């Protein structure tokens, strides 16, 4: 949703990696909040974070990195 494909293809190879690490962290922090039973969740993002990471990785493969 928030992160579209164009935006990913416009990023530089180094920007996708940085973006990847950023996303992985939001994901890890969400799963941590979830582990603590924390409900300030918003179920859509934890699900969106996974797809975003999948997209970035797909593009990195497509673009040759």
């Amino acid at each position: 949703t928030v992160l579209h494909v164009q935006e990913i293809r416009d990023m530089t190879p180094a920007e996708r990696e940085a973006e990847l690490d950023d996303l992985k962290t939001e994901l890890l922090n969400a799963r941590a909040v979830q582990a603590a039973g924390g409900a300030p969740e918003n179920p859509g993002r934890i699900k969106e974070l996974r797809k975003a990471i999948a997209r970035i990785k797909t593009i990195q493969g497509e673009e040759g990195d």
């Binding site: 992985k24 890890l28 922090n29 799963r31 941590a32 909040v33 979830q34 582990a35 603590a36 039973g37």
Partner: protein
Amino acid sequence: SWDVIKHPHVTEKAMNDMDFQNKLQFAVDDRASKGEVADAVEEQYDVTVEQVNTQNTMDGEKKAVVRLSEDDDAQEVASRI
């Protein structure tokens, strides 16, 4: 590629280790060694790991009890997540 750290293991027993022994507990990939758990943790939270104890749980996952150096404070590290 699989990541080392899955998520913080937060249970009453985990808290005691945090308050009383400056230890953090994690659910980690069962293919990870104590050394890999140590590094990954230092890099993710920027702290110094003194010792790592592991266990293959009856949940199919691996649990790691990571003690931090006196320089760091478990409660604080855990509090930011």
